[PDB]
Every structure is written in structure tokens, then in C-alpha cells.
Design a protein around this ligand. Structure first.
Ligand code: FES
Length: 94
């Protein structure tokens, strides 16, 4: 699996996520407690910010082009495509 380093307000936690699993789902399977609501890619509750590595969030609808270009990600609909580092709890930085 890809190693996903979640940089959270309570420290960095690196977890495993296969290519076919959403970031948010892997984090909750690993025991993290990340923000979410709709789980459909249509809000900002689950927003993270990619510091390194790549994700595929092609089904997302809520972020604009500039936000995605700055690394923002909806973790509920994002698959990893490499080992990656994602700051969590980023909704208020949008
Ligand atoms: S929880 Fe709404 S987009 Fe992820």
C-alpha cells in the first residue's frame, strides 16, 4: 500500500492506504478521527492539503481549480497515487 503521512493537529501519523481506498476511509480504519460530513465530494468538511505526493480526487465537485492547484484535497473522495503527506483539518484554511 501507499504510505500516507497524515499531518494532524495531534501529530503526524503514517498509515497504509491501497490505491483503491479513499484517504479518509483508510485513516478511520487506522483509528484516526478526521472531520467529515457528506462523504460525497460536495462540501469542505474533509478538506486536507497535500504537502507531497499525489492523489486522485477526480470525482470531487466542491474545490475550484485554484484550490486544487494549491494542494487542497477532499479526503473523502481522494485515492492516493503515491506515498503522500496530507495536512488534515484544513477546511478553515480554504
Ligand atoms: S465530507 Fe463533504 S466533501 Fe468530503
Amino acid at each position: 500500500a501507499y504510505k500516507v503521512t497524515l499531518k494532524t493537529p495531534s501529530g503526524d501519523k503514517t498509515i497504509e492506504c491501497p490505491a483503491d481506498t479513499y484517504i479518509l476511509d483508510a485513516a478511520e480504519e487506522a483509528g484516526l478521527d478526521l472531520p467529515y460530513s457528506c462523504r460525497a465530494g460536495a462540501c469542505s468538511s474533509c478538506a486536507g492539503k497535500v504537502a507531497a505526493g499525489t492523489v486522485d480526487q477526480s470525482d470531487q465537485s466542491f474545490l475550484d481549480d485554484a484550490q486544487m492547484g494549491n494542494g487542497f484535497v477532499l479526503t473523502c473522495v481522494a485515492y492516493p497515487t503515491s506515498d503522500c503527506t496530507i495536512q488534515t483539518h484544513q477546511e478553515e484554511a480554504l
